[PDB]
C-alpha cells in the first residue's frame, strides 16, 4: 500500500553492506507493509554479506542516534539481480550534515533530553534538539518527494 | 593533494588552499593577491621554522594528514615594517567557557 | 579562489576567505553584495557582534569542509567540535543559516 | 505466495572493506 515498501519478489539477490563511515550502522529493512525492521549492525570498516532479494528496500542509520546516513550516496538502496554471481555493493557513508544539524548531534550525545530546556541558548533550539532523527519522517519525506517526478 | 590552511598575522586569519606540490613563494603571491603586500615583504612560518622560497608546501609538512579542510594547518606570517622585518605575532583566538553541569 | 571577503568576530578577529565558500551561509549571503544585490557598491565585509572568534573560526573551517566534500564520491570524515564549544556553534550555525 | 525477509546466512564471515 505504501510507496516506499519492499516487494516479494522472492528473487534471491546478494548483497555486501559495507560501512565506509565512522559510526556503528544500523541496517533498516522496510517490510512489505513497508515498516522498518532493524537487523544487526555494522562497526565502521566492516562488510557483511547478505541474503536479500531484487525490489526490497533498505536505508541505513546510526545504530546510537538513528542519524541518517547514506548508502551509495543516496538515502534508498534497492537491490537488483546479481550479475555474474557478482554480489551487489551497498557502501555506507557519511552525509554532509548542515553545522546546525552537526551541532546538534554533538548537543544531543552530552545532553540527557529532560535536560535540554537547562540549557543557556536561543529558546527555539529547544525544539530544534527534541525533533531526533527518526526513519519514519524521512520515509515521509521520500515519499513526497517520490511523488514530485 | 590539496591542503587547506590558515594563514595567521596578528588577528587577521586568511583561509585558503593550495597544492602540496606548489612552492612557499608561489603561496606568498596568493598572499599578495589578498593583503597587496609584494612576497619581498613577507616571510611564511611553520611554528616557529621560516619557510624557504624554494620549498614544496609538501615537503614542509603541509599534506593531507595534517592540512585538511575540517582542520587545517596553521602558517604564519610576518611583514617588513619599512626596512626591518617584524618578530612573528599570532594572536590567541578566544577562550571557550567550562562546559554546563548539564553537558558533564 | 579569486574573490574573497572579511568575516569579523566580537572580539575582532579578522577572517578572510573566499567568498564562494562564506556563501555557504545563507545569513552572509543575505547580507553580502553580490551579482544580484549590488555589485557596483560592493558589500565584502560583516561583522559578528555576538560570535566570537574561537566559535567563527570553527565556521570557517565548516565552510571549507562542506565546499570540499559536498558532491564528492569520495570517503567523508566527520566534522569534528569540542564539547566546550558545541553550544555556542549550534548558536552560531543557527544564527548563520548553515 | 510465502513472504521471504531478508536474512544473514550461517556461513557468513565480516570482512574488512
Not at chain 1, 64 to 81: A, M, R
Not at chain 2, 8 to 35: C, M, N, P, Q, Y
Not at chain 2, 58 to 83: H, I, K, M, N, Y
Not at chain 4, 1 to 17: H, K, R, S
Amino acid at each position: 500500500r505504501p510507496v516506499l515498501r519492499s516487494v516479494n519478489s522472492r528473487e534471491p539477490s546478494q548483497v555486501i553492506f559495507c560501512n565506509r563511515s565512522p559510526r556503528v550502522v544500523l541496517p533498516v529493512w522496510l517490510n512489505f507493509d513497508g515498516e522498518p525492521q532493524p537487523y544487526p549492525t555494522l562497526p565502521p570498516g566492516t562488510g557483511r554479506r547478505i541474503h536479500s532479494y531484487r525490489g526490497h528496500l533498505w536505508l541505513f542509520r546510526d545504530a546510537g542516534t538513528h542519524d541518517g546516513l547514506l548508502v551509495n550516496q543516496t538515502e534508498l538502496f534497492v537491490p537488483s539481480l546479481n550479475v555474474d554471481g557478482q554480489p551487489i555493493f551497498a557502501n555506507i557513508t557519511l552525509p554532509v550534515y548542515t553545522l546546525k544539524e552537526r551541532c546538534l548531534q554533538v548537543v544531543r550525545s552530552l545532553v540527557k533530553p529532560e535536560n535540554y530546556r537547562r540549557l543557556d541558548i536561543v529558546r527555539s533550539l529547544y525544539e530544534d534538539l527534541e525533533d531526533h532523527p527518526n526513519v519514519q519522517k524521512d520515509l515521509e519525506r521520500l515519499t513526497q518527494e517520490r511523488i514530485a517526478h | 593533494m590539496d591542503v587547506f590552511l590558515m594563514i595567521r598575522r596578528h588577528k587577521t586569519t586568511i583561509f585558503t588552499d593550495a597544492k602540496e606540490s606548489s612552492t612557499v613563494f608561489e603561496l606568498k603571491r596568493i598572499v599578495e593577491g589578498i593583503l597587496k603586500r609584494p612576497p619581498d615583504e613577507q616571510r611564511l612560518y611553520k611554528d616557529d621554522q621560516l619557510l624557504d622560497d624554494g620549498k614544496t608546501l609538501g615537503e614542509c609538512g603541509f599534506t593531507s594528514q595534517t592540512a585538511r579542510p575540517q582542520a587545517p594547518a596553521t602558517v604564519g606570517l610576518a611583514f617588513r615594517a619599512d626596512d626591518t622585518f617584524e618578530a612573528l605575532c599570532i594572536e590567541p583566538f578566544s577562550s571557550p567557557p567550562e562546559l554546563p553541569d548539564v553537558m558533564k | 579562489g579569486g574573490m574573497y571577503v572579511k568575516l569579523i568576530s566580537s572580539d575582532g578577529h579578522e577572517f578572510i576567505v573566499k567568498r564562494e565558500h562564506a556563501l555557504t551561509s545563507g545569513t552572509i549571503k543575505a547580507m553580502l553584495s553580490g551579482p544580484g544585490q549590488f555589485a557596483e557598491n560592493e558589500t565584502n565585509e560583516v561583522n559578528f557582534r555576538e560570535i566570537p572568534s574561537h566559535v567563527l573560526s570553527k565556521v570557517c573551517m565548516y565552510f571549507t569542509y562542506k565546499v570540499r566534500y559536498t558532491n564528492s564520491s569520495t570517503e567523508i570524515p566527520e566534522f569534528p567540535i569540542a564539547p566546550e564549544i558545541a553550544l555556542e556553534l549550534l548558536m552560531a550555525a543557527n544564527f548563520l543559516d548553515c | 505466495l510465502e513472504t521471504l525477509a531478508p536474512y544473514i546466512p550461517m556461513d557468513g564471515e565480516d570482512f574488512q572493506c
